[PDB]
Amino acid sequence: AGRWNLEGCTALVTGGSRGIGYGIVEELASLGASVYTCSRNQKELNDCLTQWRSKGFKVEASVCDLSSRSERQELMNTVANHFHGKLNILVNNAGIVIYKEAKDYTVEDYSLIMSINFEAAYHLSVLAHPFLKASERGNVVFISSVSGALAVPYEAVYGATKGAMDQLTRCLAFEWAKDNIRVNGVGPGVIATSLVEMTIQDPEQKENLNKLIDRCALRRMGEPKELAAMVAFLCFPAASYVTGQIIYVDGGLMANCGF
Amino acid sequence: AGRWNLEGCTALVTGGSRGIGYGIVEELASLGASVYTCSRNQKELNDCLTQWRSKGFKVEASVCDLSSRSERQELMNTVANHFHGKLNILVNNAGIVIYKEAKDYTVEDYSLIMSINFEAAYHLSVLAHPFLKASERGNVVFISSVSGALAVPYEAVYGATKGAMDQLTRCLAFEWAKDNIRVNGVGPGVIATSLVEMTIQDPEQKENLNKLIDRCALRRMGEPKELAAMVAFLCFPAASYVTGQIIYVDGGLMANCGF
């Protein structure tokens, strides 16, 4: 791969059937990477494959329920074989939200969000490690959230899963440095995705989202490609001195207090 | 309680038979609070009760394995009845550590640390909510760590549990503000406890600990009472405007880069 592209790089992006994950798959592939993705719907994935391949992108995808430990192991096995045991990039993007106040969460809600948002990202990273190392130039990017550092209504537990992810990001940057793997996190602010489309369905959640956008310096939602651009950069050989960082792509939301 | 004391306040401190928790019990009690504590060792708890009571402290304790959901429920029931349904203070101090690199953790390891370090704290907070609210002046203090914010050898997963705790702390401060409950976190640096004594039994870990001490401005470990002082203060009616904060009692560790 050249200084500003990913020509010849292999990548695995979790949850790439829509939203941010979809934009990340497009960005990485358009920059020359060979991409592999997953989601829980085969039909959806196949329609994504048809669009991507129509653009000349090298992409492959298979169904995987990241909430399942055995399914994750199966996914990594499949990917390793598909890439010949060499994986340059791992983007832990899949995630879900359960809008409830902390005390209204059930054991099932908690277990589900924790397994998909944090455990899956942690598990998959460890599973990918030998292939990232074998690649000799590995990159692990976690997709966090501003909600992992600051209070947002109905995101106490969702925020906790991201807070755990952020700390894991910092530590892995040090534990895997000798393996030539850089590890960073990208925290999106409000990005127009299906998750957001379903959110504004609720009038209260719609109003809560409007607050966020207004606390943005740019006062507008970001686009998946605006988030994907940062993820792509961190993978470029050009970003070789960047590691252990959690970068926010939020239109200035994190820098705000009274605006 | 006056502005600088806890006369008449009721409190629950988890893991108060040793180290920081022990120090917190003694501090709160010496300031007038009626305290209830727990741990997994009945014999140790009885020795403690004798020590504290002979000093005139109002303390009570029962054995409880915080890694168990049912035991946590049982604990809350007993404390609520012991305090007649009114709990002013809850200090989530109990925690353990497993010193393995992220990729060497077993599922058992991960489940254990996450259940005691984060789940127990989250669950206990929710169980205590009605009683904290009933007290008319509640305080919840989470004992975090500098490790929940920055990388420390063998504390990738441990740090993740604290990072989750820190975010939960910030959110609960907002969700429970209307119930007149303040929520804060206190992150200790290196405090002389049994956990620390066991740790330095291993030469490599002893050297890693010396790196931390050498990196704090005061260049020495703190004592349990030094950490306890900050916990007691946040509970004082004097700290009525402090909430949603994570304060570090670390001899300056968190402010250092090149010293």
Ligand SMILES: NC(=O)c1ccc[n+]([C@@H]2O[C@H](COP(=O)([O-])OP(=O)(O)OC[C@H]3O[C@@H](n4cnc5c(N)ncnc54)[C@H](OP(=O)(O)O)[C@@H]3O)[C@@H](O)[C@H]2O)c1
């Ligand atoms: N949109 C925002 O404003 C925003 C802000 C901050 C952070 N984020 C983070 O960005 C990431 C993506 O969010 P998004 O808004 O793009 O969401 P989205 O539009 O709902 O897309 C999520 C993607 O992840 C997949 N996925 C979810 N659970 C999965 C599972 N258990 N197994 C396999 N695939 C799974 C979904 O596919 P299936 O449902 O078909 O399986 C989908 O492809 C998340 O980690 C989210 O926390 C988003």
Ligand SMILES: NC(=O)c1ccc[n+]([C@@H]2O[C@H](COP(=O)([O-])OP(=O)(O)OC[C@H]3O[C@@H](n4cnc5c(N)ncnc54)[C@H](OP(=O)(O)O)[C@@H]3O)[C@@H](O)[C@H]2O)c1
């Ligand atoms: N010491 C430091 O330098 C330091 C630094 C940063 C953060 N911390 C945090 O401070 C807190 C206390 O640390 P410490 O150094 O005081 O530890 P410690 O000396 O090992 O004391 C921990 C206390 O919690 C109890 N405990 C542990 N697991 C329990 C369980 N599953 N159920 C019931 N009780 C349990 C222990 O009793 P049993 O084992 O007998 O049950 C003990 O009474 C922890 O959250 C730790 O993460 C400590």
Ligand SMILES: CN1[C@@H]2CC[C@H]1C[C@H](O)C2
């Ligand atoms: C309302 N929230 C904002 C945008 C979408 C949803 C989840 C995210 O982490 C932050």
Ligand SMILES: CN1[C@@H]2CC[C@H]1C[C@H](O)C2
């Ligand atoms: C070595 N670590 C330092 C001190 C004790 C153990 C846990 C803690 O959170 C930080």
